[PDB]
Design an enzyme around this catalytic site. Structure first.
Site, PDB file in Angstrom:
ATOM      1  N   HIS A 109       1.044  -1.192  -0.297  1.00 44.74           N
ATOM      2  CA  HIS A 109      -0.289  -0.387   0.012  1.00 44.74           C
ATOM      3  C   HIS A 109       0.712   1.404  -0.239  1.00 44.74           C
ATOM      4  O   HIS A 109       1.982   1.458   0.910  1.00 44.74           O
ATOM      5  CB  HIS A 109      -0.625  -0.084   1.299  1.00 44.74           C
ATOM      6  CG  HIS A 109      -0.052  -0.089   2.825  1.00 44.74           C
ATOM      7  ND1 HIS A 109       0.642   0.967   2.850  1.00 44.74           N
ATOM      8  CD2 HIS A 109       0.348  -0.710   3.469  1.00 44.74           C
ATOM      9  CE1 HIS A 109       0.823   0.953   4.600  1.00 44.74           C
ATOM     10  NE2 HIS A 109       0.998  -0.430   4.749  1.00 44.74           N
ATOM     11  N   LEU A 115      -5.231  -4.026  10.056  1.00 49.54           N
ATOM     12  CA  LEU A 115      -5.513  -2.848   8.555  1.00 49.54           C
ATOM     13  C   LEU A 115      -4.468  -2.391   7.506  1.00 49.54           C
ATOM     14  O   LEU A 115      -4.341  -1.495   8.097  1.00 49.54           O
ATOM     15  CB  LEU A 115      -7.037  -3.085   8.610  1.00 49.54           C
ATOM     16  CG  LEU A 115      -7.064  -2.566   6.781  1.00 49.54           C
ATOM     17  CD1 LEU A 115      -7.261  -3.198   5.768  1.00 49.54           C
ATOM     18  CD2 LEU A 115      -8.348  -2.319   7.288  1.00 49.54           C
ATOM     19  N   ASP A 116      -3.222  -3.233   6.707  1.00 51.61           N
ATOM     20  CA  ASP A 116      -2.381  -2.778   6.200  1.00 51.61           C
ATOM     21  C   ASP A 116      -1.331  -2.008   7.210  1.00 51.61           C
ATOM     22  O   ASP A 116      -0.444  -1.077   6.605  1.00 51.61           O
ATOM     23  CB  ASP A 116      -2.616  -1.725   5.343  1.00 51.61           C
ATOM     24  CG  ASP A 116      -3.778  -1.786   4.388  1.00 51.61           C
ATOM     25  OD1 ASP A 116      -3.770  -2.401   3.300  1.00 51.61           O
ATOM     26  OD2 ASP A 116      -4.291  -0.665   3.588  1.00 51.61           O
ATOM     27  N   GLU A 117      -1.732  -3.099   8.497  1.00 50.77           N
ATOM     28  CA  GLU A 117      -0.441  -2.581   9.444  1.00 50.77           C
ATOM     29  C   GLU A 117       0.395  -3.545  10.303  1.00 50.77           C
ATOM     30  O   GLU A 117       1.571  -3.443  11.300  1.00 50.77           O
ATOM     31  CB  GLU A 117      -1.212  -1.787  10.873  1.00 50.77           C
ATOM     32  CG  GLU A 117      -1.422  -0.205  10.141  1.00 50.77           C
ATOM     33  CD  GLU A 117      -0.303   0.747   9.729  1.00 50.77           C
ATOM     34  OE1 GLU A 117       0.625   1.010  10.960  1.00 50.77           O
ATOM     35  OE2 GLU A 117      -0.887   1.850   9.450  1.00 50.77           O
TER      36      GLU A 117
END
Lengths: 279, 281, 279, 281
Positions: free
Chosen positions: B189, B224-226
């Protein structure tokens, strides 16, 4: 004998013709030129270094009506003049030492009118360089009074820029408003951001692969004033938190020096809440 | 020389490398590469060792490695360097990472076997066909989130893939799906300095006058995304880049960042270390 | 209390086992390990930083038979020891000043036993840092004798490294052999290479887009000795010859500092006519 | 906005920008970009100006530019920014630069029309076919160097190409071939520090223990691999890179370097300045 013209204005037809037309009228040889037109802010920017082939004073006077017609904010500086700067520092030496070395060696052509601090620590560093040092300590009941003290030194010294070389006291809204766009701050930066205590331990814990820093103008806004420069350096899993700190401080030095250099070379313009920086 | 690579992680303690090199010396293996890292903060130790036979009963080597792994509580593996790891690529309507990966694969930079491309959209079925790769379209509706995951998780299992690459696959994996693919799925991302949340982050980046644009590749978790960061890359930009030009830069950085992470994975150079990673060069 | 073991030897079976076996025998905790096997030169290299959990002296003693067995060149250094260095300089300040700053600020952890020059220009600089300075002028009939003067200073000072911070006299073959692999030189570099007069004018004429520098070990070979580091910086058509010069000198500073740091941190090994440099 | 780009170079003198902007103001053109450079050592002046109409008789604008060009001795051009420059790509047996250009083109990074791919070998005929591009194989023998050049120079003329890209085309152009393609052919080659001449330069680079690998893109002249430099790029390497790994890096840097030069050319950002170039950002 050179001079540098900088200007910004609302973008409008005839601006370039007006400016180059003037330079031609006064027989000025153009050593450098850079123009930028921001169609989103509808703002036009020019930096022009030139020299005459009596003529520059006439150009300055005749520039006034052109500036009024296009609503231009502008300046013409003698390139040989060294901008006057005041450097503020606390107990961390790295940014101050870096700037003084770049100044000593002729990379940063500025006159340091003084070094001011809330701590006495760098009096000897200022002395090793023949620079005035003023120590203005802070107590719980004297935060506004201490600010007025160094703001007084700022005014009387003729400085046009305050460099916050890791000055660690938060500037009041009134100080920030007064120094708006005439002071440059430096701080570390991370991807992702880490807020709160021990950010380098957080960065180590998260295993970031980059460490950065951001230099920006001080303003009286809710968030950080306009960004001037950002730099990052690559790190890896082998860097302990103290080694990340070392990289961060190094990156703060480079980042601040670039910002300061761009300011004293007249290559930085305000464009609302962002900046235009010419190479 | 036919090479193999031993990777291992285990709790910090003394004597692992001696035990490993001792076994290798006994099998008359030449050590080509050896990288060791002890993380005294997480109390975890990591080794990657590439070697080849000098004269190799690889099965007998693995068998004799067991007492070592048991004693030192190691997670480990020995891979054949010639073997091409099997990978499954997920994509949605954005082509850029998928196209970049296919190019690097076709030219031989990424030495992996792509067992399939899977998508919630049909957009890249032709792209897959052009590369001779299986493609599966598994659409999603408000109701069929759980069913659709079961479908592609089935492809994942039956294909033999050992890595799922989320090449801008724009659906959030359930906690069930993340757990089943733990340490076996890489996401990419965009990343900003400072961070930008919500809609139109490239417009926010533009209005904020950032001078850098980045991307982060990480292992997939519930958060989420981490999840654990594998790689981060940034590219310099300036005031002249409009939002759509910053977007173009971000997509380029996503490509390079994802390719770097996938390459480290298939070369057996990335290890999990709790919430972070160890990536050997 | 840390120590650093470095070694290189012909690659042979059992070399890792011997080294790690000894480290484990003496209960040494490994803080840093890096090994490299060069299958083309058939040479093996190890850098190991460790600390004991009396033990290190015994380890050193027992390292002797293993070294003899494998034909290893090796050393164990106390990390707290500051390697002794001698800096040579002529009339160009930039590299010397850069090193003195990095030293002053604690980045280069070394003891500067002296600064020696063929000119008196940097005596005051040396005095400002509390460092010994020796001026040994040169004349047509005394080139051999002047070299002997500073070579004597080098021997008596206990220095293990000579840093040629733009020392502008060519070293004789005898001086080069004597300092072989114990002296680091720095010079500019271009793509393509420019030989002869005014290389920065040549670089400008050819419109190169990169300017670089190379740090290398001094040897008594026909061409320059082994390369330690190379760095380049981007430039463009707007850079006049004097501006290219400025970039080149800056890159010489960074390049030399990286080579010197790698030497004093025991991260550089000779590998025939090339070097192994560990990060 | 429908944009146009004016480029010009001329001997140094006063009054050019004033005359140019004056004309553009008279046609109510909005200036989007303006970059000027005077080289006081070569006594040459350079301008690039991107503009669009606000309320555009382009052929009346060109006609009115003539008195300006004549007075100031300008070489100049006004290009439609939407027009895709026509390019001919030459290749031999090495795929990497050709493949890289074709990918950047397919993905929309290089906005150009490839009128053909010409080669002294048949190898890349299928690569051309897959992109819907014409391929011409013109083999060379001992006694036919001049005849073969005539064949591909004919394709260059009849195709309407304005740029020949030598994507590792490994035959030396004749002085006649170079002259016909002056300021219209870009070459790419590897670059070392220090320079290496002769056989196996990457082995030489390896033995010399270089820490960087580069490439240079340049306009073609009679002088073999020398000509006005457009772009140079380098990549860091270390002691662990074998000769073949150095080669892989060199080829990667050749790709990037050529792509940057080609992009500069089609964006009208590159000017000749005697033995060097001016390249606006």
């Amino acid at each position: 004998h050179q001079f540098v013209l900088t200007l910004s204005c609302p973008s409008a037809a005839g601006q370039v013709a007006a400016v180059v037309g003037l330079l031609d009228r006064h027989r000025c040889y153009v050593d450098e030129l850079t123009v930028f037109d921001d169609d989103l802010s509808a703002r036009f920017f020019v930096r022009c270094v030139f020299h005459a082939t009596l003529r520059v004073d006439a150009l300055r006077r005749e520039f006034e009506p052109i500036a009024e017609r296009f609503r231009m904010q502008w300046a013409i500086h003698d390139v040989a003049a060294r901008p006057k700067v005041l450097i503020m520092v606390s107990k961390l030496e790295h940014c101050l030492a870096d700037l003084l070395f770049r100044w000593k060696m002729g990379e940063l052509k500025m006159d340091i009118v003084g070094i001011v601090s809330n701590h006495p620590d760098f009096a000897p560093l200022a002395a090793q360089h023949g620079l005035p040092f003023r120590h203005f300590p802070i107590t719980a009941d004297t935060k506004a009074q201490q600010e007025a003290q160094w703001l007084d030194v700022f005014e009387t010294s003729g400085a046009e820029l305050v460099i916050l070389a890791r000055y660690m006291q938060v500037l009041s809204p009134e100080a920030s408003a007064r120094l708006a766009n005439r002071a440059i701050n430096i701080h570390h930066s991370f991807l992702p951001g880490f807020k709160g205590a021990k950010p380098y331990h957080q960065a180590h814990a998260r295993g970031v692969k980059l460490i950065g820093a951001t230099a920006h103008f001080v303003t009286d806004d809710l968030d950080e004033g306009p960004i001037i420069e950002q730099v990052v350096e690559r790190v890896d899993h082998s860097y302990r938190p103290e080694q990340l700190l070392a990289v961060g401080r190094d990156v703060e030095c480079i980042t601040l020096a670039r910002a300061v250099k761009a300011f004293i070379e007249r290559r930085v313009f305000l464009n609302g809440d962002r900046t235009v920086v010419f190479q």
